[PDB]
Amino acid sequence: VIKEFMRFKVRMEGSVNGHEFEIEGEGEGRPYEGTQTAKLKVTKGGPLPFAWDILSPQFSKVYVKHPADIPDYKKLSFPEGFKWERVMNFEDGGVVTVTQDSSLQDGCFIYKVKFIGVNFPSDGPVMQKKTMGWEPSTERLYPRDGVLKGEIHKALKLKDGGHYLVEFKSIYMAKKPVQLPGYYYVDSKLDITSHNEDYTIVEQYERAEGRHHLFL
Amino acid sequence: VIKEFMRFKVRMEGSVNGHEFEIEGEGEGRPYEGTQTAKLKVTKGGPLPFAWDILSPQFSKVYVKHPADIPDYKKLSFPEGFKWERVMNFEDGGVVTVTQDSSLQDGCFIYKVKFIGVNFPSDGPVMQKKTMGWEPSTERLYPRDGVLKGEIHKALKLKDGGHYLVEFKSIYMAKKPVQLPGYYYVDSKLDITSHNEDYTIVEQYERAEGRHHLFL
Amino acid sequence: VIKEFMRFKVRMEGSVNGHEFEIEGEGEGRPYEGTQTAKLKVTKGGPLPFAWDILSPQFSKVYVKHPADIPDYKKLSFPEGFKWERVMNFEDGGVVTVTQDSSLQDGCFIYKVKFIGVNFPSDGPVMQKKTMGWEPSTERLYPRDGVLKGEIHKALKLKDGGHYLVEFKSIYMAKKPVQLPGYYYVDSKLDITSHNEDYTIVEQYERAEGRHHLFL
Amino acid sequence: VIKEFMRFKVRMEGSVNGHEFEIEGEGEGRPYEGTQTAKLKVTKGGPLPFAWDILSPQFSKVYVKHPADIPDYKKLSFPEGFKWERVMNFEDGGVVTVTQDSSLQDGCFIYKVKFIGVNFPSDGPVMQKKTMGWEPSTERLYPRDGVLKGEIHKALKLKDGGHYLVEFKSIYMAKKPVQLPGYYYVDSKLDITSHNEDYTIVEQYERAEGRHHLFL
Known part of the structure; x- marks a missing residue:
């Protein structure tokens, strides 16, 4: 069911420091090659009063390229x-939680995202739009709790130089349990x-x- | 506008470990005496697969009793x-964020809550419903960032004895800036x-x- | 063995951001009334290049006044x-761990403290000595793990106004399993x-x- | 001053959950090749009542192989x-801080380490010695604050399967402001x-x- 080329559609309902917004978009990519694009549009609550960069990683890990010897849990779930x-x-104390549902409808992935971000300093790089994109990253993954x-x-990256640091903790939950990998890494x-x-x-x-x- | 007796209406859209639900309710109390009651009904996604106790403090700090010499910021905002x-x-690693709007409509407070809880262990006290209510608490408050x-x-409290610990960090934001207190405490x-x-x-x-x- | 008036002697070996120091002092007070004084002298590594205030709470909870119905674990341990x-x-990311031994000799309490503080920003209030004392505080205590x-x-408090926040987590370990209290509070x-x-x-x-x- | 082969000597004074200990040892390796060995002996406080694995990464990053285009800050510091x-x-709430000095004496590296670990559960994998070595890891480094x-x-790795997770934050402080790298990674x-x-x-x-x- 996962072809060499696949599209997706995404919708997000979110809030940051009490400011609510909605975003709709679509994307496409090559799930076995690990590459994809997305185009997003703020449909409610725009223009946003904070850095786009905090939203970017919430709009698709079914596209990660996996070697044959590492179980591709997210592809397997479809x-x-x-x-x-x-x-x-x-x-600087900002905290976000995100919850996301990924489904497949007549050959197109369907993403639905809810996002709540709180406790951002009003003068900090998020609310003052001082960020200039992510460094490339490396995630450490392991199985736990099935x-x-x-x-x-x-x-x-910060406009005036240096970095603004963020720790991500993610949980990927197949709708029916499928085979898990061991301890491994994803470069993004x-x-x-x-x-x-x-x-x-x-x-x-x-x-x-x-x-x-x-x-x- | 805040009378000695006030009612409220509340609704919540929430999710915990990917389980979505909706709750609607109402309450009433004595805002200057510091006392109130609420009655909540799960309207979607019931019965809930996790402890009610994590939701209870999300259903009303306009009802806190304040001495005359401590500015009552939340009452002042109306x-x-x-x-x-x-x-x-x-x-045990669970993390929740919550965002809430409190307004006043024809003498009734109107509460709207969004809640996302993630990363609860499947065998932990929340998902296994092993909790037995909150201890009374004491919050440390201070002004910051206006x-x-x-x-x-x-x-x-845990069914089998002992305690399951949780740190709260809250931010209260008047829709128009009103007078702030200094460093103080709220017993609940x-x-x-x-x-x-x-x-x-x-x-x-x-x-x-x-x-x-x-x-x- | 704990009289209504007790003296103590204290020695600390510590480090902050790689700067090593030693402090010696003495104190006295009324353990059943909850009041005490201390006088400390930096004996090595002075003058300190950071705020004294981070050290002050490491130089004596046997002096806390307890009501008869709350077991006074620390006093019972003598x-x-x-x-x-x-x-x-x-x-701002600074972290300290502290380990301390409290004993009794010559009718005097004897305190031995080791302290490691790391990750303080060089331009922050600790390294730049911008603090002017603690607010009074309220500790939440409970028994766990014996x-x-x-x-x-x-x-x-910051010299030019505002607050610099610090979370304390403490563990008190009697040398024998003397009686524990339940959930309670200590104001200091x-x-x-x-x-x-x-x-x-x-x-x-x-x-x-x-x-x-x-x-x- | 840093040769293709270099020896080191190390001494550690440490404590975990109130148990004090001292360790001494020696090592050797190839600083430009990224390889080294160490042999440690507990000299006071043995046998240790906790997992050796929490100490192993405190006994030598001058032996990290760097490409010519990434400044080797630790080697430059000599x-x-x-x-x-x-x-x-x-x-599970355990926290350790570590402070270390690295110098060079008569062509040998000299390491002095102080270690304070607190808040480990008594029935946890550290105090119950349930660990069986670290997974290989990848550190994310960047310059900050000079x-x-x-x-x-x-x-x-846990003896009977699964993982026990630990986040490391390290700060490396050359004694003079030798050249810093940018954002980069170290595999160990x-x-x-x-x-x-x-x-x-x-x-x-x-x-x-x-x-x-x-x-x-």
């Missing part, structure tokens, strides 16, 4: 699909590739590949 | 009202007073009072 | 005494009463009293 | 050397190669190599 959840802990979990030390790199003036229309690109630790 | 946000950090913030070390005690077999209909009572530290 | 350990998590634990949301207020220009000689006063929650 | 500090945050910092999501794999029955004599091996993210 056609029914999987849910994923996440905590982002920002170094599901797949992963954590990442991520970083946003997400880019904002174009946008209008107020970031109410934004395009993204992501490359991601799973692997064993290099020393194994 | 008639327009205020928003509040919260992180709950559970000791708004009011507070934190609490809270604890759920929330009780589940009645419930049906599967906790799809639940009643609660809360008492809350603000004060200076006892040594001042 | 003559043999008890150990205590602590984590302080500062809001020992007594407590947590506190504390705050340092620590004051720096005098000091020389470079904080190489400092005097402190503390008041502390245990109690049930006020609504009980 | 002959004077560098200090490093660390927080380990364990998933020093080099890094974080790692690490895991101890540490092995216990042999030990006696009570872990009072232990031998270790480590491989470590720095690199850019693989997608760069």
Whole structure:
């Protein structure tokens, strides 16, 4: 059911520091090659009063390239699909939780996302839009409790230089339990590739590949 | 606009570990005396597969009794009202964020809540319904960033004895900035007073009072 | 063995951000009334390049006043005494762990403290000495694992206004399994009463009293 | 001053849950190749009542293989050397801080370590010795505040299967402001190669190599 080329549609309902918004979009990519694009539009609550970059990683890990010897739990979960959840802990006290449902309808992935971000300092890089994209990252994954979990030390680049640090903790939950990998890593790199003036229309690109630790 | 007796209406859209639900209810109380009751009904996604106790403190701090010399920021915010946000950090890794809007319509408060809880162990006290209500608590509050913030070390009692610890961090944001207190404390005690077999209909009572530290 | 008036002697070996130091001092007070003073001298590594305030709460909870109906675990532990350990998590990323032994000799309490503080920003209030004492505080305690634990949301006042937040987690370990209390609170207020220009000689006063929650 | 082959001597004073101990040892390796071994002996406080694995990463990052295009801050710091500090945050609440000095004396590296670990559950994998070595890991490093910092999501393998998770935060402080790298990664794999029955004599091996993210 997962072809070499697949599209997706996504909808997000979110809030940051009490400001509510809705975003709709679509994307496409090559799930076995680990590459994809997305185009998002803020449909309610725009223009947003905070950094787009905190939203970018919430709009698709069925596209991660996996070697044959590492079980691809997220691809295996289809056609029914999987849910994923996440905590982002920002170094200045911002905290976000996210809950997401991934399904497949007549050959198109369907993503539904809910996002609540709180406790961002009003003068911090998020509310003041001082970020300039993510560094590429490396997630550490392992099985636990019959599901797949992963954590990442991520970083946003700052306009005036240096980094704004964010820890991700994610949980990927197949709708019916499928085969799990062991301890492994996923390398990712997400880019904002174009946008209008107020970031109410934004395009993204992501490359991601799973692997064993290099020393194994 | 805040009378000695006030009613409220509340609704919540929530999810815990990928399980979505909706709750609607109403309450009433004596905002200057610090006492109130609520009755909640699960309207979608019942019966809930997790402990009711994690939801109870999300259904009303306009009812806290304040001495004359501590500015009552939340009461002062009416008639327009205020928003509040919260992180709950559970000791076994569960994390919740909550975002809430409090308004006033023809003499009745109107509460709207969104809640996302993630990363609860499947065999832990929340998913296994092993909790038996909250200990009474004491929140430490202070002004910051033009708004009011507070934190609490809270604890759920466990059926088999002992406590399941949870840290609250809350942010109270008037819709138009009003006068702030300094550093102070709020003592609270929330009780589940009645419930049906599967906790799809639940009643609660809360008492809350603000004060200076006892040594001042 | 614990008289209405007791003296103590204290020695600390510590480090902060790689700067090593040693402090010796003495104190006295009324263990059943919850009041005590201390006088400390930096004996090696002075003058300290960081705020004295992070050290002040490491130089004596046998002096807390307890009502008859709450077991006074720390007093019961004598003559043999008890150990205590602590984590302080500062809001800007500084972290300290502390380990302490409390015993009795020559009718005097004897305190031995080791302290490691790391990850303080070089331009932060600790390394730049921008603090001016603690707010009074309220610790939440409970028994666990056959020992007594407590947590506190504390705050340092900033010289030019505002607060710098610090979470304390403490563990109190009697040398024999003397009786434990239940869930309860300790109110404390620590004051720096005098000091020389470079904080190489400092005097402190503390008041502390245990109690049930006020609504009980 | 750093030759193709270099020896080191190490001494550690530490404590875990109030149990004090001292360890001394020696090591050797190839700093430009990223390989080294160590042999440690517990000299006071043995046998240790907790898992050796929490100490193993405190006994040498001057032996990290760096490509020519990534400044090797730790090697550049010699002959004077560098200090490093660390927080380990364990998933069950254990917390350790570490402070270390690295110098060079008569052509040998000299390491001095102090370690304070607190808040480990008495029935947890550390106090019950249920661990069986670390997974290989990947540290995310970046410059900040004129020093080099890094974080790692690490895991101890449990004897009867599964993982016990630990987050490392480290700070590396050269004694003079030698050149810093940018954002980069270090892959490491540490092995216990042999030990006696009570872990009072232990031998270790480590491989470590720095690199850019693989997608760069």
